[PDB]
Design an enzyme around this catalytic site. Structure first.
Site, short mmCIF file in Angstrom:
data_model
loop_
_atom_site.label_atom_id
_atom_site.label_comp_id
_atom_site.label_asym_id
_atom_site.label_seq_id
_atom_site.Cartn_x
_atom_site.Cartn_y
_atom_site.Cartn_z
N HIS A 138 0.87 -1.20 0.00
CA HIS A 138 0.00 0.00 0.00
C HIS A 138 0.90 1.24 0.00
O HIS A 138 0.62 2.19 -0.77
CB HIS A 138 -0.87 0.05 1.26
N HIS B 48 3.24 10.98 7.63
CA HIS B 48 2.61 10.68 8.94
C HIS B 48 3.62 10.05 9.86
O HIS B 48 4.21 8.97 9.59
CB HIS B 48 1.47 9.65 8.74
#
Ligand SMILES: NS(=O)(=O)c1ccccc1
Ligand SMILES: NS(=O)(=O)c1ccccc1
Ligand SMILES: [Zn+2]
Length: 257
Positions: free
Chosen positions: A61, A116
């Protein structure tokens, strides 16, 4: 399984993760004129002096850089946070083109990527117990624009060739995540969720206002990774961002006047 394609992307995720249509989903659009300065916010403290990186992983991903979280060594505190949150990982999301890629948006503007820095609340003992709690996580979000190279990113970019496909990892010791930050810690904050399944509603989001600049060549290297595993048809890893979700009954607060 879930991903970012037409068939298994964000508009499908709700079928297996019904919280996808929940009351505190992320990311969101940050309407700067509606965000309000909050004087009750304490100063933010990013303390990454003893951060210990372990490994970088292509999870099919995106890629994750993993940290040793077995001691209080890289922590985030202050701002909206009660207590101490320990760094466990960082991940990025990016686009197929420089005009898209970020998950949060600012007055509807999409940046070329978003970083993040994921932390868990040490009152819950470890990451898996923290993600069952409404204040379990704090994610520091940082926008990337294309312009000057970011030198502190280059060690990431140079290792990607060794994790091209799903399930590949590489040693990634002695990497200092401080070199990924912008100068200013001005931020917006709101309660939200993980932005990938399982979409758990455990996150205090702290999104920095100042983007970092990365070069076109750096971001081009992200777009050479693959979603597929070794010896499978190539599907370039691009556009692994979830679009903005309804704000619902939430207020975005600003750290700055
Ligand atoms: N709902 S989901 O996890 O995105 C999913 C979508 C298509 C097939 C299998 C799973
Ligand atoms: N991409 S994110 O919201 O920071 C995230 C962090 C850990 C697990 C899953 C998602
Ligand atoms: Zn992420």
């Amino acid at each position: 399984h879930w991903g970012y394609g037409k068939h298994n992307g964000p508009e499908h995720w709700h079928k297996d993760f019904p919280i996808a249509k929940g009351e505190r989903q992320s990311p969101v659009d940050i309407d700067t004129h509606t965000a309000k300065y909050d004087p009750s916010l304490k100063p933010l403290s990013v303390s990454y002096d003893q951060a210990t990186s372990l490994r970088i992983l292509n999870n099919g991903h995106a890629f994750n850089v993993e940290f040793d979280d077995s001691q209080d060594k890289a922590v985030l505190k202050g701002g909206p946070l009660d207590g101490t949150y320990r760094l466990i990982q960082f991940d990025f999301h990016w686009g197929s083109l420089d005009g898209q890629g970020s998950e949060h948006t600012v007055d509807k503007k999409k940046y070329a990527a978003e970083l993040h820095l994921v932390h868990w609340n040490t009152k819950y003992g470890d990451f898996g117990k923290a993600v069952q709690q409404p204040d379990g996580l704090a994610v520091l979000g940082i926008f990337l624009k294309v312009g000057s190279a970011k030198p502190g990113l280059q060690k990431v970019v140079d290792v990607l060739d060794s994790i091209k496909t799903k399930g590949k990892s590489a040693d990634f010791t002695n990497f200092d995540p401080r070199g990924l930050l912008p100068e200013s810690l001005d931020y917006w904050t709101y309660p939200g969720s993980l932005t990938t399944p399982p979409l758990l509603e455990c996150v205090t989001w702290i999104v920095l206002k100042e983007p970092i600049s990365v070069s076109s060549e750096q971001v081009l290297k992200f777009r050479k990774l693959n979603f597929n595993g070794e010896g499978e048809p190539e599907e370039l890893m691009v556009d692994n961002w979830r679009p903005a979700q309804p704000l619902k009954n939430r207020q975005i607060k600003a750290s700055f006047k």
